[PDB]
Design a protein around this ligand. Structure first.
Ligand SMILES: O=C(Nc1ccccc1N1CCOCC1)c1ccsc1
Ligand SMILES: O=C(Nc1ccccc1N1CCOCC1)c1ccsc1
Ligand SMILES: [Mg+2]
Ligand SMILES: [Mg+2]
Lengths: 546, 546
């Protein structure tokens, strides 16, 4: 029956409420109880606060009006304001104090996911204070989670006036009994209740949520931990740079702050970073998530040498020049992990800090032909399968759904061994036609990869594997160098190919290397353990790249 | 006969040279003359400095090797190093000290413009110092001006070895007598001279430039002031955001730092900002140059109300949300100028600072119908011509070259009066078929605009003019507000439509308004006075938006 959920901001999605501070400030300052609130509310519908909340005046204009309401209110109660009394100060402090109430956001989140139309409905102001950015951030983070955000000052109406509710109903395209509205102020519920909306007076969050679970029949409270926010491809800023005339790189770009350039592996996409992109933007970074040369909307020239590490590197440098970035943080996984290490070795001036997931940095052996090196470990056999142009393309292109549904699996869900893949004559030989969906991915997400790989298929991607001689010879030029820029390695416990012990000696060549480790995590690190990954990167970014 | 010019970096494109600092440091510290340089050069082709310059080792690795060469050199001369002696310190200071030698860059610039292949050829290092960003910036600014940049450490060879010169000749695709090479070190010229290259030992810049003018037959020295750097469309990072399902905004993006969003006017393009984009990036800003709704690669829906100021505003807010920017500096010209004022009025939380070129902020008159208001000033007559859908489109679309070649003119170059354009029945009625090229623009630049406007033509653009009722009613909601965020107005002396006196009262509504004025500047401010514009914006950004 209920189809919409509407959340107040102050005192509901955001705590502590700012009436909260007015209560305390009076006590702190030992003023007559409620005096500050009488000021705030002076003149009712025609007073300074209502005009603010309607958007007739800005917050900087109302401040000295409240001041006056604070002089008048105290004259009338026969008490003197403190020397140094500051309305700007109290409110600045109150506003920066408020944070997102996480459990209310997650309860709203879940209701959206179960198909409700959600909205925020708030009395707020046109904020022009020097420090306005704090709240703009907070509102930005909140709104991307809701169908609508209605602001008293934007629409020229306020709670409790009965016209905002009509506007609300009208915006939701729904009738007053399909709607639940939670608000911390009894008076705001009053009129919603009249048109016959379910309401919830919000005191403590848990009780509110109990009422809300009880009224919607959906489990909200004590629910398992939700995934981090993901990215919907078509709501992203997409970017394009020509790095040389036949070749353009595509990327998705979110946030502001130091540039963070994410380099996916084989056979993946910018989308492989879908759970990190909002997290890092939100952490204060400018995220640039590549389609690496050969993939998605980047170009995919056919020639093998277009993908040697040297050329891939030069072209990433070109990508910075053309974007006007002197440096970026380089974060890579799998093949992108190899790429960022070599960026650190060959262009340290352009790398603010380097990090790799799963992919260790192991210096080339100048006295062992590079093919011999690979052949010396059974687990890399699929690499030799990749050599002969045509063969792996044919198999991997033959059924795209199957391909990704076969590859993108957690550590206990495997359906192919990376084992004797040459001898068996295929990567899919004893594995199913229609695999079951890994718990890591929805059908839709696989379809995204499927649709990307239909632009160029696997020639480009596989070519990354087809330059061992060339890459070996190039890498040998760096054998005297060490990596002395900031640097993080993150090992994944149950990656059975890029195993953690492989990384054991990295300190020899990167003496200040910082480490992270993720347990119970397979090869597809970003999507397998998105929560742990974000937390490790955000902590290392704030301390080492900031 | 000469076809290529090659410039050393240290001591040629960049001053003071760092051997410069080694000389001084010894004197400062009263060390045996040349001792520091004997350290630096210890071991000749097999010493620590050569391995650095070949890229065998990084700069952080060489530092403590130089230290040792500084101990050994002093033992042998029988003197003690100062307590606190610091190689890192000396070099940090030396490196941050070096700047681009402007007159050498401009002489290289001009030679490129006269069709020479240019390059930089430098002994330099893989820099991994904490402070490496300083020099990465400097190199970035330099390289975008040259066909090639050859670095000893990137190519594994050094000046004076004769193999780098072969590589040089080979990279330039030219023979040793088609090449001039300027370098501050006699020894580096030695081998270039042998293969028969013209060379120039570079002591003071002016003499060097005299030699270079004398050898190329091109005026380099005392030449008039060059325009600021422009943007070549196809070397730009191009970005795309869907702000609602039928509608995407396109922009060009350069630099890093606080976001600066440039809003062009009618009937223009992101390209109208071509001279500001590199300047502001270079000044430490993240420039986002829009195609405004209706133009270039942004979408151009046909309906008139898609272009009222309210909707244009909401959609720019949406553009920030989707890019993950809580704020941006909004800079506008003409119609974009009107837009940024209203952004400041309606979304101050999202505007870091606001600036307008030519376009004043004049509050709506609530007691005068908006059509009457326009009709009350002869100079705005072309605005009424724009009203009736179809008419202006027909004329403006009829010959695109003519249209822009007619509009884009300086103040003394006019070929149409904005005068009685309704009565005369066209904006072009008594003006030429093939106008002469304004001094402000090259044929190619006009062709760019021509090619952009062929995607949608003028319906979208003209619609910006077709919402006066609607925009008037919307604007009246803001009559109580003031603009109290940071704010700059820049008036153009000889803009005869958006005249400077029009801006006279703006202080009434924007009490902290900062001003700039440009003399001898017509309506197309950015391209008319690109040097003065950049300087006014960069100075206001650094003090007010930083
Ligand atoms: O191109 C490959 N690896 C690589 C990539 C980039 C730089 C160096 C290397 N290595 C360094 C160690 O020596 C071999 C080349 C490769 C690995 C498996 S299939 C092809
Ligand atoms: O839409 C126009 N102007 C405008 C634009 C945006 C906001 C307010 C306004 N004004 C405010 C002053 O009153 C009239 C509307 C316009 C001007 C010449 S042709 C159409
Ligand atoms: Mg509340
Ligand atoms: Mg030199």
């Amino acid at each position: 029956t209920l189809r919409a959920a509407v959340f107040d901001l102050d005192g509901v999605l955001a705590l502590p409420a700012v009436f909260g501070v007015l209560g305390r400030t009076e006590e702190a300052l030992a003023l007559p109880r409620g005096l500050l609130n009488d000021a705030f509310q002076k003149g009712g519908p025609e007073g300074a606060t209502t005009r603010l909340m309607k958007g007739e005046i800005t917050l900087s204009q109302w401040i000295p009006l409240m001041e006056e309401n604070c002089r008048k209110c105290s004259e009338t109660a026969k008490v003197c304001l403190p020397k140094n009394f500051s309305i700007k100060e109290i409110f600045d402090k109150a506003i920066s104090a408020r944070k997102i109430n996480r459990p209310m956001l997650q309860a709203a989140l879940m209701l959206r996911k179960k198909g409700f139309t959600t909205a925020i409905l708030t009395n707020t102001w046109l904020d022009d204070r020097a420090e306005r950015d704090g709240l703009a951030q907070l509102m930005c983070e909140l709104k991307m989670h809701f169908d609508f955000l209605i602001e008293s000052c934007q629409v020229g109406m306020v709670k409790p006036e009965p016209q905002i509710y009509k506007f609300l109903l009208d915006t939701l395209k729904a009738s007053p009994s399909e709607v639940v509205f939670l608000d911390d102020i009894g008076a705001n519920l009053k009129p919603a209740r009249d048109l016959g909306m379910v309401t919830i007076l919000v005191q403590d969050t848990d009780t509110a949520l109990k009422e809300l679970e009880k009224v919607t029949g959906i489990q909200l409270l004590n629910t398992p931990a939700p995934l981090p926010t993901s990215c919907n491809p078509s709501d992203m800023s997409h970017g394009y740079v020509t790095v040389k005339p036949r070749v353009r790189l595509h990327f998705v770009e979110l946030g502001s702050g130091p540039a963070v350039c994410l380099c996916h592996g084989f056979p993946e996409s910018w989308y492989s970073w879908r759970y990190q992109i909002p997290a890092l933007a939100q952490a204060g970074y400018r995220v640039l998530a590549m389609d690496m040369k050969g993939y998605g909307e980047s170009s995919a020239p056919p020639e093998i040498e277009e993908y040697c590490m040297e050329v891939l590197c030069k072209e990433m440098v070109t990508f910075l020049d053309k974007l006007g970035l002197s440096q970026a943080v380089f974060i890579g996984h799998d093949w992108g992990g190899m790429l960022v290490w070599y960026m650190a070795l060959f262009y340290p001036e352009r790398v603010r800090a380097v990090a790799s997931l799963n992919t260790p940095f192991i210096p080339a052996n100048p006295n062992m032909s590079p093919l011999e090196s690979i052949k010396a470990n059974p687990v890399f056999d699929y690499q030799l399968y990749f050599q002969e142009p045509g063969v792996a393309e044919a198999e991997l292109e033959q059924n795209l759904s199957r391909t990704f549904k076969s590859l993108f699996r957690a550590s206990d869900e495997s359906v192919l061994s990376m084992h004797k893949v040459c001898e068996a004559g295929g990567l899919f030989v004893n594995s199913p036609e229609e695999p079951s969906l890994s718990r890591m991915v929805t059908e839709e997400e696989i379809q995204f990869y499927v649709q990307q790989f239909k632009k160029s298929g696997f020639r480009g991607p596989l070519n990354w594997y087809r330059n061992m001689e060339r890459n070996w010879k190039w890498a040998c030029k760096s054998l005297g160098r060490k990596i002395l820029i900031p640097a993080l390695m993150v090992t994944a416990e149950k990656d059975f190919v890029l195993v953690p012990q492989m990384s054991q000696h990295m300190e020899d060549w990167i003496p200040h290397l910082k480490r992270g480790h993720i347990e119970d995590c397979g090869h597809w690190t970003q999507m397998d353990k998105p929560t742990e990954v974000n937390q490790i990167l955000i902590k290392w970014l704030d301390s080492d790249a900031r």
